[PDB]
Design a binder for this molecule. Structure first.
Ligand code: 3YM
Ligand code: 3YM
Lengths: 310, 310
């Protein structure tokens, strides 16, 4: 499979594919993704970094925006604190094997020319468009504040200043990205990654207790949290354990099982694993045990790189 | 009458009087007023500059904010053009005898620290409060834009940065000023001037054709526009000619009249003039003629100062 199909793999959508094909033909091309600094870096984050690595292998220069200013506008706390967490996030992304440049929103996002462009875009953006674009991004406040409508314009302006040909993010960014394609002279090609279900089975993976696997979780934590995850027998839809098997695991894979309903089950691919689970041949307990052990191996290099840093 | 009563004269309200009395007791005190640059400087503007002169005579240091950035957010055009009109406004205010310092919103209003404070205030201001505060200031748009809710926060931030003890403006600024008293550590004392009715008798004085007397209008223009102004016999309420007689004219004043229903009418004060007009003893024609001639004399020094500048 060529660069395109590799990039397309495990994405929810590309806006547009035709535009990506044109981007691919360029000698120099860049792709950016922005993250509001987060106290835990979890598989939701890793899934997107994995896509940036794909883009990088396809000859893209990668920029990671550490969106401190954005987090500040999205009520995440004081800049000083947000920036501190941004510093930690940078180390984690680096530990994930990603070769990228890292830019803080505040690096450029408080400059005169940048700010003037925020106001210029604000002249162009309806309150209605701005508010809708934040539906999947903010909490929906009782009486929403002005900061909420400044956020999307600032994200659009960051996309402009970073200058990437491609913008990558989760499906929840799609309204901001579509706004960016209407407001900016250069239409960015948007690559959206699927939303990874939280371990609770209730909404996306997030820093809520027990709801996430952090890339630097210890093995006991990974086992404990995977053990208690939502994972009904025979149920694939909204099953976060199956999603993890789909997006992170390597195949062929052997699932260790004892003798009763055993033994070691060889699975050639995710699709084989899917059939076996839906038919209740593979029970949730064995599935979880194997995903926990594979995840430990998968995440091990990241955790040890981080620990070895003093 | 003391400084307080002089300052209070011809104002619509002071928020609050008790706070003004305290301000007055200070050795050094400042008062600011902001104007979006305007192509014509008219009696609506002059009425407020007259109040700044009063404040100045009472020992206040005066700051005039030329609100270019604000005008830009209020859709008045491009910064370059707005700033050009700002330069002309500065000359007119100077020609009005006012001793003040002049600051453009963009002088400080694009600095990092200033901008960070805009975002900080935006975190504090509901979209609902922001929008209401702009009701008497913006056009009420079909689908309002984000810029409209950035405007009031920027005006509040300017008040903070300029640092005046008093903020002066028209009654239409009252919601922004009240917001400034909630959002800033130092509560500014707000002095609001009445809204001067336009010559058309339909809403405030404004740059619409025939609706204003510009401080630098030639005498023929002043006579023509006063002649066709709204001015029903015996009607004082909403009569822009009576308002002009109230706010700009000097008394005692002699109204020139011919022999039939004559002759020269001596008026000791605005109140005398009011009674005579309501009782239809003074007809609109004689009233307009005298206001036109007095206005020509009143505005003459301003026009000639401006013309003498090359
Ligand atoms: C506003 O700044 C950004 C925010 C984000 C975060 C994203 N909107 C999210 O909440 O997932 C990404 C890139 C940005 O430039
Ligand atoms: C937003 O900037 C300002 C605007 C104005 C203009 C005022 N709001 C008006 O429209 O009359 C005054 C002072 C300011 O600092």
């Amino acid at each position: 499979m060529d660069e395109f199909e590799m990039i397309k793999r495990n994405t929810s959508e590309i806006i547009s594919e035709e535009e990506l094909r044109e981007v691919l033909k360029k000698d120099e091309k860049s792709a950016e993704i922005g993250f509001e600094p987060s106290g835990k870096i979890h598989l939701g984050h890793y899934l997107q970094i994995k896509k940036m690595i794909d883009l990088q292998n396809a000859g893209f220069d990668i920029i990671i925006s550490l969106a401190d200013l954005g987090a500040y506008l999205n009520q995440k706390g004081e800049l000083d604190e947000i920036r501190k967490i941004g510093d930690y996030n940078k180390k984690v992304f680096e530990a994930m094997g990603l070769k990228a440049k890292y830019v803080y929103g505040s690096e450029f996002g408080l400059d005169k020319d940048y700010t003037l462009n925020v106001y210029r875009l604000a002249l162009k953006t309806t309150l209605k468009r701005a508010r809708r674009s934040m539906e999947l991004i903010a909490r929906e406040d009782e009486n929403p504040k002005v900061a909420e409508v400044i956020y999307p314009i600032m994200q659009v302006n960051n996309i402009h200043y970073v200058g990437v040909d491609v913008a990558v993010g989760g499906m929840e960014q799609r309204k901001i990205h579509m706004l960016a394609r209407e407001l900016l002279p250069k239409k960015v090609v948007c690559i959206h990654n699927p939303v990874l279900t939280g371990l609770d089975g209730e909404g996306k993976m997030s820093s809520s207790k027990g709801n996430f696997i952090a890339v630097d979780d210890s093995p006991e934590e990974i086992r404990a949290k995977i053990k208690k995850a939502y994972c009904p027998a025979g149920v694939v839809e909204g099953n976060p354990i199956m999603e993890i098997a789909k997006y992170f695991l390597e195949y062929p894979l052997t699932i260790k099982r004892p003798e009763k309903f055993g033994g070691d089950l060889t699975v050639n691919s995710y699709e084989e694993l899917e059939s076996l689970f839906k038919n209740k041949e593979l029970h949730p307990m064995d599935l979880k045990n194997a995903v926990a052990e594979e995840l430990i191996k998968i995440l091990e290099p990241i955790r040890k790189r981080l620990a070895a840093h003093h």
